[PDB]
RNA sequence: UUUUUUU
């Protein structure tokens, strides 16, 4: 039931088409904060439902306002994500649950024509990646001065170096120092350390809310994910991975293998231990192929995806029951987000980290920092 | 390193 929340009958019917019949904890704990207009920073584990944590109350709020739908109208909501496929996926959690609001998704490697047409038609909710959106602001086509709501998903990556400046210049169009006409700021991640909270305060009002479902003294990773580790020299790694997938991935199960470089990921996808069922996904793949590859992985045209961290965050593929990491990452955030491509929305999954003898120090650091212990198989 | 306008 939805009886504690102001969700219309029409949104309940659309949410049923997505398999949503009640709010998950992170959604229940944030709904009135978002709906009523307060700023919010929220931390919850991978796979617990952060996307609808902002999308449903924002849609209910916007449905309850005037909405005259004039042609060429400026966006009321901005959502930023760190990758093109994540933006596309987040886009659909708005679009699937409104018939009224015009939802647009702008990112790179896409033709401009369709994006200009949506701008001419009018946008209510804009989801996208920073680069292409910055581009449309600077060519004069996009108006973000009328934003009422700004979501940074994966906020800790959006505000790290590599995005901080791009994000800053985009938000500088809508945010001014010391102001009460600034849009509502909504910030979400499975990993929200002190530094992110500190940088976040610059964009938030004094009246902001915090919701932390992870807390201290709790494992950082999704609770339904089992963590295993395999010691293996890099010369053996491809073959053992091939055998691991055959026995640790289940009936109609999908596997993601994460590697540290585009070069490693591409070459592993070619290795005959896995190439027959595998495709690569990384930033040197042209965007049309990235989307075809991801869609095939989602619908089960092949069962093994070899990816860089382009696929580490946000992507939700329910059939992924096996994550393999080719080596322990030096950033524990990377291990946490990668491991969380499995074990989502209460399903169990397995994450297996390969490591060389000289990478054992990094394995131990991931263990300690994430609050987990690897079974060494 | 890896994302992320254009190339
Ligand atoms: N209330 C709900 N009822 C049923 N399914 C839900 C509900 N909320 C979310 N889901 C589904 O659960 C999955 C996880 O949601 P998602 O919003 O991707 O999690 P997340 O917290 O953003 N994970 P991440 O980005 O990896 O840190 C998706 O398949 C959702 O559609
Ligand atoms: Mg997410």
Residue numbers in the entry: 187 to 563
Show me the paper's own sentences about this structure.
RNA helicase DDX21 plays vital roles in ribosomal RNA biogenesis, transcription, and the regulation of host innate immunity during virus infection. DDX21 is composed of three domains, including the N‐terminal domain, the middle D1 and D2 domain, and the C‐terminal foldase domain. In summary, here we reported multiple sets of crystal structures of RNA helicase DDX21 either in ligand‐free (DDX21‐apo) or in complex with AMP (DDX21‐AMP), ADP (DDX21‐ADP), or a nonhydrolyzable ATP analog (AMPPNP) and a 15‐nucleotide poly(U) ssRNA (DDX21‐AMPPNP‐U15), corresponding to different unwinding states (except for DDX21‐AMP). We elucidated the conformational rearrangements upon the ATP and ssRNA binding during the dsRNA unwinding cycle, and described an RNA unwinding machinery including one wedge helix, one sensor motif V, and the DEVD box.
The two domains (D1 and D2) of DDX21 clasped ssRNA, enfolding it within an interaction network that was dominated by polar contacts. DDX21 formed eleven hydrogen bonds with the phosphate groups of the RNA backbone and recognized six 2’‐OH groups of RNA backbone, which thereby discriminated against DNA substrates. Uniquely, Gln352 recognized both the base moieties and 2’‐OH group of U4, which was not found in other DEAD‐box proteins. Thus the RNA was bent between U4 and U5, and the bent region was located near the DDX21 motif Ic within the conserved α6 helix, the so‐called “wedge” helix. The presumptive attacking water for ATP hydrolysis was close to the γ‐phosphorus atom of AMPPNP and interacted with the side chains of Glu340 (motif II) in the D1 domain, His523 (motif VI) and the amide group of Gly500 (motif Va) in D2 domain. More importantly, only in the AMPPNP‐bound form, the residues Asp339 and Glu340 within the DEVD box bound to the γ‐phosphorus atom through Mg2+ ion and water molecules, and incorporated with multiple inter‐domain interactions.
